[PDB]
Curated annotation (Swiss-Prot):
S-S bridge residues: 34-123, 178-249
Single Gene Ontology MF annotation: serine-type endopeptidase activity
Binding residues for Ca(2+) 2: 16, 260
Transmembrane as UniProt keyword: no
Binding site for Ca(2+) 1: 175, 177, 200
Organism lineage string: Eukaryota, Fungi, Dikarya, Ascomycota, Pezizomycotina
Organism: Parengyodontium album
Reactions performed catalytically: Hydrolysis of keratin, and of other proteins with subtilisin-like specificity. Hydrolyzes peptide amides
Protein name: Proteinase K
Any single GO CC term annotated in Swiss-Prot or TrEMBL for this entry: extracellular region
Cited function: Hydrolyzes keratin at aromatic and hydrophobic residues.
Length: 279
């Protein structure tokens, strides 16, 4: 399939070179998989989700996304226009409030909640989680990531946005999950993206057009935005039978576009998520 004049980052994870605007992908498009966006929620009523999104948990007085961050991330995962896995089922877990913040213990609760809830959902092709959030190193927050992964969810986490080594941030530093740095449409590392040997992969993170609340769409930037490209890609690959939730971070690394980013420090992978669909 092909979706012309696509946001640059969808084109980019289906291209070997930068500077193209069509997204080439297999039409199964993540059918039969499930992605949990653990964030500020999802405006499920957005036309762009087409009935494929459901809040299923909020730790606040309301489950609605009143911030837009979660809605944006979820759109990159699985909205019809702006998404990677255009036919996956989305599930929202509101751990962050509407200013986008949230206490560690609420975040850990939401994570353990996915390890369990997945057993209340039909996700025969695989289950992913996407965590576009992070704060300073915590053994506990990391351990909640690891539990989620161990239970058989592909966990994708933002590496952070301070320009540092991500080894000091959580859940980014945790080893056993898939820590996602950011890039721009000219294959530069995004100027805010964290780096460091704990990263597994880069995806598109600078000027990422996706959904917003009110039914609306904006471009924003962040490792938040890079993270749901890798989650959605993991869903797409599960569905195609290429990989599994426990194997998907390694499969994505193995099949990435290797050398191609500039602005990589020494010691950080130079790997760019690729769907290996057009070539
Ligand atoms: Ca890993």
């Amino acid at each position: 399939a092909a979706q012309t004049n696509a946001p640059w980052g969808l084109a980019r994870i289906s291209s070997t070179s930068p500077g193209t605007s069509t997204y080439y992908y297999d039409e199964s498009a993540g059918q039969g998989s499930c992605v949990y966006v653990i964030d500020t929620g999802i405006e499920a009523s957005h036309p762009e989700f087409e009935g494929r999104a459901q809040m299923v948990k909020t730790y606040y007085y309301s489950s609605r996304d009143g911030n837009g961050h979660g809605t944006h991330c979820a759109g990159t995962v699985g909205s019809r226009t702006y998404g990677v896995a255009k036919k996956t089922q989305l599930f929202g877990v509101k751990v962050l409030d509407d200013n986008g913040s949230g206490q560690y213990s609420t975040i850990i609760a939401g994570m353990d909640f996915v390890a369990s809830d997945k057993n209340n959902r039909n996700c025969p092709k695989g289950v992913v989680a996407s965590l576009s959030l992070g704060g300073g190193y915590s053994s506990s927050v990391n351990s909640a990531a690891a539990r989620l992964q161990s239970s058989g969810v592909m966990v994708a986490v933002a590496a952070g946005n301070n320009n540092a080594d991500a080894r000091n941030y959580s859940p980014a530093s945790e080893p056993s999950v898939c820590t996602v740095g950011a890039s721009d449409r000219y294959d530069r590392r995004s100027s805010f993206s964290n780096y460091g040997s704990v990263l597994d992969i880069f995806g598109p993170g600078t000027d990422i057009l996706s959904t917003w609340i009110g039914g609306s769409t904006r471009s924003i930037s962040g490792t938040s935005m890079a993270t749901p490209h890798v989650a959605g890609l993991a869903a797409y690959l599960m569905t195609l039978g290429k990989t599994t939730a426990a194997s998907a971070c390694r499969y994505i690394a193995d099949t990435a576009n290797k050398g191609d980013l500039s602005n990589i420090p020494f010691g950080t992978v130079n790997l760019l998520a690729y769907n290996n669909y057009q070539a």
